[model samples]
Target: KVFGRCELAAAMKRHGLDNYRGYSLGNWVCAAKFESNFNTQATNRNTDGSTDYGILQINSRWWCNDGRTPGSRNLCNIPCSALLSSDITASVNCAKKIVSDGNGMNAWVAWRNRCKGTDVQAWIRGCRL
Candidate 1:
């Protein structure tokens, strides 16, 4: 919860996400920054009667179950709470599964609204990856 962007990047890299689906590390870093500010414990209630979970802000409608969201597909086969851990293995793995579904970083609105088409290098500027 008190980690740095560099550390997050390193962890993500270790998770085999350095260039997931042709999206650069900058894209992931920027999306994560805008999605949850890199807070692994972060959750957001969307206007569409769904909740976003963890660092990537994955949606409950398809990704995981938050218990309150009805009719969740739980495509990741994980509890939403599993994404809130500092370890981030579950979250990152789920994210990979998501991108593999053809959404890429576009799975996160923050990426489309803010990170997309922008210079994302600043998200990892000071990070010694």
Candidate 2:
């Protein structure tokens, strides 16, 4: 089986693991859609130009910096980039944690609601998990 950032993001979003809605899945998915356009590889900077990246547009340099090359980079004690450089799984989990703080069901509900009308399965059918 193969998994990509987008699929992982879907699981994370559908599960409400991000606590996006301040404790609601509905808000989390909404945030995800707005954040990465549902593309996990999405990366960008905020209006202040801080360095946000990833599916949730998490700061790639902030979280992904450390995991640059697994056994080669050693990206410890980096910063918010930790959410990225580690690994897709680690990054998604971290994002989920960030939103949920251990309770991210909110994001899930949001996904459930929006997913119904998005035709996501049809659009990304090639990558359906």
Candidate 3:
């Protein structure tokens, strides 16, 4: 599923990503834009053979068990497939776990490169809070 801007923002807000670990809804939206363009099934395989799944690009290496990545930590204790859903409950929960691990939003390279320290307000502009 491809999320519209406000839709994504509202969903993230409901999931508590707004100002989560000091990263605003716009920040999460910006990261989503760069990471997977709001596609629920977006997946990227790393050179290390780990796979990143879903909107936040949750990694198989440390977050989800893909049953393919070696040495997976399964930190979220969820199947990687669970992240590839429009519902976003699993995705949001796993993302929270990553941030709570002290990685913050910096866990996603897209967040650091595109959303970090940037005026993410525009990403959620014109959207109802």
Candidate 4:
């Protein structure tokens, strides 16, 4: 797990996710904070039999296969296990495509519940990105 919020923000910047897909870096960081707290291995099974993966918490209903969920679209094509790594390149790429596919950050429930329309600047208040 990541030690600090600023560290996660810097990593996002280093990976070219800052201001990605027309969304602000602050928004991305804020979403990550609520989604998986910047932990790559984070996962959750929903009541609807869907699962979320990675720091982005991408849904298994359409994005990736978790094996337990049948008939998955596997749109991201990469294994869900790949999203659990500290190396987030695959997850980031998948998230980028997700944002571009008309969902934007709205694809994430965490963003809609917490990060959306908020003063996300506080997510990186003390960072030097």
User: Best by TM-score, which number?
Assistant: 3
Per residue, candidate 3 scores C-alpha lDDT tens digits across 16-111 of 877988867788888888899988899998888899997889888878888887788886878999999879788888888888878577778887
Candidate 1 similarity to native, TM-score: 0.91
lDDT of 4 at 50: 83
Off by over 4 Å in 3: none
Q: lDDT value for candidate 4?
A: 0.81
The regions of model 1 sitting more than 4 angstroms off are none
Instruction: Give the per-residue Cα lDDT of candidate 3 at 66.
Output: 88
User: Which ten contiguous residues of candidate 4 have the minimum total lDDT?
Assistant: 1-10
List the lowest-lDDT window of 10 residues for candidate 3. Answer: 111-120
Candidate 2 lDDT at 84 equals: 39
lDDT by residue (9-118, candidate 1, tens digit) is 88887888888887778888777788888788888888878888888888888789888877778878888998888996888899989888785567778888777778
lDDT top scorer: 3
Off by over 4 Å in 4: none
Q: How displaced is residue 109 in candidate 3, in Å? A: 0.7
lDDT of 4 by residue, 57-97 (tens): 88888799788887789878888888887876878888888
Q: Cα lDDT for residue 92, model 2?
A: 58
lDDT for each residue of candidate 2 in 1-129, tens digit (9 for 90 to 100):
123435554575554464444543434445566555555545565454345655555543434452332322223234444443425555555565445445443333334454445544343334442
List TM-score per model, in order.
Answer: 0.91, 0.43, 0.94, 0.91
Q: Select the stronger candidate by lDDT from 2 and 3.
A: 3
> Clashes in each model (backbone N, CA, C under 3 Å)?
0, 27, 0, 0
lDDT-best of 1 and 2: 1
